[PDB]
Amino acid sequence: PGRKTNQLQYMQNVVVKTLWKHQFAWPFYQPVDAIKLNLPDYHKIIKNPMDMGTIKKRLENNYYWSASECMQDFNTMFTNCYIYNKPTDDIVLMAQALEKIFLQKVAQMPQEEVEL
Amino acid sequence: PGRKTNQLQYMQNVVVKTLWKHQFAWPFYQPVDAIKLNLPDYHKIIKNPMDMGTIKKRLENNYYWSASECMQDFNTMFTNCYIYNKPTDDIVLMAQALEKIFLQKVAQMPQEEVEL
Amino acid sequence: RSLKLLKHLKH
């Protein structure tokens, strides 16, 4: 049972909007295709796949009851990348840079969540 | 097998130095590995593989006798990319941006090749 | 449009 809240509007119109424009965001626009990309252990390790295209669609269709759930999906997306890849891989540094922006935006979100 | 020339020094310290730092250069840093990248038709289509890491190492190891060879290796690297990939693929747009800079620098290279 | 890029990134 989703909702429209001030914080969810912020997640869609600030957080997703800002991250999508970043030059490092493109690996996260769609689900990881482990077969196409030749990552045969991906789904053995990553059991909760998430990507920013899915998050964007969820916000556009009022899937979430609270922005906390949307923040959870972002954390899953970043953490999956940190888990699957090796510590020095470029994609990990890209994800870290995106997470830094994510956290900066979250810090400026309205602190109390109000249903609109 | 090679020499020092004014044009080769220019290829190393101007052309490669500039291209290596470019935001779009990273797909060209290493030979295409058709096994790891899951490209079963790459070697069927591409018979003369080249990449910018190989070009850079050749310059650092004085492999080239003339800058004409290094310019042709760049031409091969770029042309292979256009032959293998679709004209709408992002990698082709990246290659084109790099090749324009390559050509701009080639336009400004010393016109007579002199052994040093 | 970015698939070869994603492959290069991962490998």
Short mmCIF file of all heavy atoms in Angstrom, two decimals, chain B residues 3 13 20 23-25 28-29 38 40 42 44-45 51 57 66 86 90 92 94 101-102 111 115:
data_model
loop_
_atom_site.label_atom_id
_atom_site.label_comp_id
_atom_site.label_asym_id
_atom_site.label_seq_id
_atom_site.Cartn_x
_atom_site.Cartn_y
_atom_site.Cartn_z
N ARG B 3 63.07 3.51 -33.45
CA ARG B 3 63.92 4.69 -33.36
C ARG B 3 63.27 5.67 -32.41
O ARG B 3 62.11 5.51 -32.02
CB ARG B 3 63.98 5.43 -34.70
CG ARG B 3 64.78 4.79 -35.76
CD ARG B 3 64.90 5.69 -36.97
NE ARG B 3 63.61 6.00 -37.57
CZ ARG B 3 63.48 6.77 -38.65
NH1 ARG B 3 64.56 7.30 -39.22
NH2 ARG B 3 62.28 7.03 -39.16
N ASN B 13 54.02 12.06 -26.20
CA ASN B 13 53.89 13.09 -25.16
C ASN B 13 52.77 14.08 -25.42
O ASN B 13 52.41 14.83 -24.50
CB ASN B 13 55.21 13.85 -25.01
CG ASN B 13 56.35 12.97 -24.52
OD1 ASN B 13 56.13 11.99 -23.81
ND2 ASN B 13 57.57 13.32 -24.90
N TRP B 20 44.92 9.48 -23.38
CA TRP B 20 44.83 8.58 -22.23
C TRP B 20 44.05 9.21 -21.09
O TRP B 20 43.36 8.50 -20.34
CB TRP B 20 46.23 8.18 -21.76
CG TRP B 20 46.23 6.95 -20.91
CD1 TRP B 20 46.11 6.89 -19.55
CD2 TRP B 20 46.33 5.60 -21.36
NE1 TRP B 20 46.14 5.58 -19.13
CE2 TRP B 20 46.27 4.76 -20.23
CE3 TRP B 20 46.46 5.01 -22.62
CZ2 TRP B 20 46.34 3.37 -20.31
CZ3 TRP B 20 46.53 3.62 -22.71
CH2 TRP B 20 46.47 2.83 -21.56
N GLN B 23 38.03 11.37 -20.96
CA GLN B 23 36.96 10.68 -20.26
C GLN B 23 36.45 9.44 -21.00
O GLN B 23 35.90 8.53 -20.36
CB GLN B 23 35.81 11.66 -19.96
CG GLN B 23 35.18 12.33 -21.19
CD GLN B 23 35.86 13.64 -21.64
OE1 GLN B 23 37.07 13.85 -21.46
NE2 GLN B 23 35.07 14.53 -22.24
N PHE B 24 36.62 9.37 -22.33
CA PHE B 24 36.11 8.26 -23.13
C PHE B 24 37.18 7.24 -23.52
O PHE B 24 36.88 6.34 -24.31
CB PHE B 24 35.45 8.77 -24.41
CG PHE B 24 34.22 9.62 -24.20
CD1 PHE B 24 33.75 10.41 -25.23
CD2 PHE B 24 33.52 9.61 -23.00
CE1 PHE B 24 32.62 11.20 -25.07
CE2 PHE B 24 32.39 10.39 -22.83
CZ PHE B 24 31.94 11.18 -23.87
N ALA B 25 38.41 7.37 -23.01
CA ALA B 25 39.50 6.52 -23.49
C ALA B 25 39.50 5.12 -22.89
O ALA B 25 40.04 4.20 -23.51
CB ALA B 25 40.85 7.17 -23.20
N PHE B 28 39.45 1.55 -24.49
CA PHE B 28 40.55 1.29 -25.41
C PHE B 28 41.88 1.06 -24.69
O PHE B 28 42.91 0.96 -25.36
CB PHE B 28 40.63 2.43 -26.43
CG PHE B 28 39.32 2.67 -27.12
CD1 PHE B 28 38.45 3.67 -26.67
CD2 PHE B 28 38.91 1.84 -28.16
CE1 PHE B 28 37.22 3.87 -27.29
CE2 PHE B 28 37.68 2.03 -28.77
CZ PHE B 28 36.83 3.05 -28.33
N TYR B 29 41.87 0.94 -23.37
CA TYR B 29 43.13 0.81 -22.63
C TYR B 29 43.79 -0.55 -22.80
O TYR B 29 45.00 -0.65 -22.57
CB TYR B 29 42.91 1.04 -21.14
CG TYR B 29 42.72 2.47 -20.70
CD1 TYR B 29 42.25 2.75 -19.43
CD2 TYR B 29 43.00 3.55 -21.54
CE1 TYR B 29 42.07 4.04 -19.00
CE2 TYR B 29 42.82 4.87 -21.11
CZ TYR B 29 42.35 5.10 -19.84
OH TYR B 29 42.16 6.39 -19.39
N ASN B 38 32.66 -11.94 -23.71
CA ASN B 38 31.56 -12.68 -24.31
C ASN B 38 31.21 -12.11 -25.69
O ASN B 38 30.08 -11.70 -25.96
CB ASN B 38 30.34 -12.68 -23.38
CG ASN B 38 29.21 -13.55 -23.87
OD1 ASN B 38 29.43 -14.52 -24.60
ND2 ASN B 38 27.98 -13.20 -23.49
N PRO B 40 31.66 -13.71 -29.07
CA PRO B 40 32.07 -14.89 -29.85
C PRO B 40 32.34 -14.63 -31.32
O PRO B 40 32.94 -15.48 -31.98
CB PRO B 40 30.90 -15.87 -29.65
CG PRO B 40 29.73 -14.98 -29.40
CD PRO B 40 30.27 -13.82 -28.60
N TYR B 42 33.92 -11.69 -32.42
CA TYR B 42 34.87 -10.59 -32.55
C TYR B 42 36.03 -10.98 -33.47
O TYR B 42 36.40 -10.23 -34.38
CB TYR B 42 35.39 -10.15 -31.18
CG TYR B 42 36.15 -8.86 -31.30
CD1 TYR B 42 35.48 -7.64 -31.32
CD2 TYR B 42 37.54 -8.85 -31.43
CE1 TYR B 42 36.18 -6.45 -31.46
CE2 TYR B 42 38.24 -7.66 -31.57
CZ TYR B 42 37.55 -6.46 -31.58
OH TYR B 42 38.25 -5.29 -31.73
N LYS B 44 36.15 -13.38 -35.66
CA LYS B 44 35.68 -13.62 -37.02
C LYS B 44 35.67 -12.33 -37.83
O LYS B 44 36.01 -12.33 -39.02
CB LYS B 44 34.28 -14.23 -36.98
CG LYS B 44 33.61 -14.36 -38.34
CD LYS B 44 32.21 -14.93 -38.19
CE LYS B 44 31.50 -15.05 -39.53
NZ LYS B 44 32.27 -15.89 -40.49
N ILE B 45 35.29 -11.23 -37.20
CA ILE B 45 35.10 -9.96 -37.88
C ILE B 45 36.39 -9.14 -37.92
O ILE B 45 36.66 -8.46 -38.92
CB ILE B 45 33.95 -9.20 -37.19
CG1 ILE B 45 32.63 -9.97 -37.40
CG2 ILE B 45 33.85 -7.78 -37.70
CD1 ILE B 45 31.49 -9.46 -36.53
N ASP B 51 44.74 -1.66 -29.67
CA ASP B 51 44.21 -0.89 -28.56
C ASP B 51 45.24 0.15 -28.17
O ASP B 51 46.40 0.09 -28.58
CB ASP B 51 43.92 -1.79 -27.36
CG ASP B 51 45.19 -2.40 -26.81
OD1 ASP B 51 45.71 -3.36 -27.43
OD2 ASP B 51 45.68 -1.90 -25.78
N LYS B 57 52.52 1.27 -24.98
CA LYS B 57 53.67 0.45 -24.64
C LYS B 57 54.68 0.42 -25.78
O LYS B 57 55.89 0.48 -25.55
CB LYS B 57 53.22 -0.97 -24.27
CG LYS B 57 54.32 -1.89 -23.78
CD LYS B 57 54.96 -1.35 -22.50
CE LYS B 57 55.70 -2.45 -21.74
NZ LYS B 57 56.84 -1.91 -20.95
N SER B 66 58.68 4.59 -37.28
CA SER B 66 58.14 5.85 -37.76
C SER B 66 56.79 6.12 -37.13
O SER B 66 56.02 5.19 -36.85
CB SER B 66 57.97 5.86 -39.28
OG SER B 66 57.22 7.00 -39.68
N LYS B 86 27.60 -1.43 -33.69
CA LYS B 86 26.56 -0.70 -34.39
C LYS B 86 26.82 0.81 -34.31
O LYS B 86 27.41 1.29 -33.34
CB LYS B 86 25.20 -1.00 -33.78
CG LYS B 86 24.82 -2.46 -33.79
CD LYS B 86 23.33 -2.63 -33.51
CE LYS B 86 23.06 -2.77 -32.03
NZ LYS B 86 22.69 -4.17 -31.68
N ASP B 90 27.18 3.23 -27.81
CA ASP B 90 27.91 4.32 -27.15
C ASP B 90 29.40 4.24 -27.42
O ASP B 90 30.07 5.26 -27.57
CB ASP B 90 27.63 4.30 -25.65
CG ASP B 90 26.27 4.84 -25.29
OD1 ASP B 90 25.72 5.67 -26.05
OD2 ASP B 90 25.75 4.42 -24.24
N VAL B 92 30.96 3.49 -30.02
CA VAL B 92 31.29 4.09 -31.31
C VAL B 92 31.29 5.61 -31.21
O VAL B 92 32.15 6.29 -31.79
CB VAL B 92 30.31 3.57 -32.38
CG1 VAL B 92 30.32 4.46 -33.58
CG2 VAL B 92 30.64 2.12 -32.75
N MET B 94 31.99 7.24 -28.48
CA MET B 94 33.21 7.54 -27.74
C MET B 94 34.43 7.48 -28.64
O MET B 94 35.29 8.38 -28.61
CB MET B 94 33.36 6.56 -26.58
CG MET B 94 32.24 6.69 -25.56
SD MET B 94 32.11 5.29 -24.43
CE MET B 94 33.47 5.63 -23.33
N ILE B 101 39.92 14.19 -31.67
CA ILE B 101 41.05 14.77 -30.96
C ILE B 101 42.37 14.27 -31.53
O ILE B 101 43.32 15.04 -31.71
CB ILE B 101 40.94 14.47 -29.46
CG1 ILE B 101 39.71 15.16 -28.88
CG2 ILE B 101 42.22 14.88 -28.72
CD1 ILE B 101 39.33 14.61 -27.57
N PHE B 102 42.45 12.96 -31.79
CA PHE B 102 43.61 12.39 -32.47
C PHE B 102 43.91 13.17 -33.75
O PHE B 102 45.05 13.60 -33.97
CB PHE B 102 43.29 10.92 -32.76
CG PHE B 102 44.22 10.26 -33.75
CD1 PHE B 102 45.51 9.90 -33.39
CD2 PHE B 102 43.79 9.96 -35.04
CE1 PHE B 102 46.36 9.28 -34.30
CE2 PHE B 102 44.63 9.35 -35.95
CZ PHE B 102 45.92 9.00 -35.58
N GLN B 111 55.93 18.34 -39.26
CA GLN B 111 55.62 17.80 -40.58
C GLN B 111 56.74 16.97 -41.18
O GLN B 111 56.48 16.11 -42.03
CB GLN B 111 55.23 18.94 -41.54
CG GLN B 111 53.82 19.46 -41.33
CD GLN B 111 52.78 18.36 -41.45
OE1 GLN B 111 52.52 17.84 -42.53
NE2 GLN B 111 52.17 18.00 -40.32
N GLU B 115 65.13 11.87 -37.05
CA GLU B 115 65.60 10.95 -36.03
C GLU B 115 66.33 11.70 -34.92
O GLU B 115 67.11 12.62 -35.17
CB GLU B 115 66.53 9.89 -36.62
CG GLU B 115 66.90 8.82 -35.61
CD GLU B 115 67.65 7.65 -36.20
OE1 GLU B 115 67.82 7.60 -37.43
OE2 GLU B 115 68.05 6.77 -35.41
#
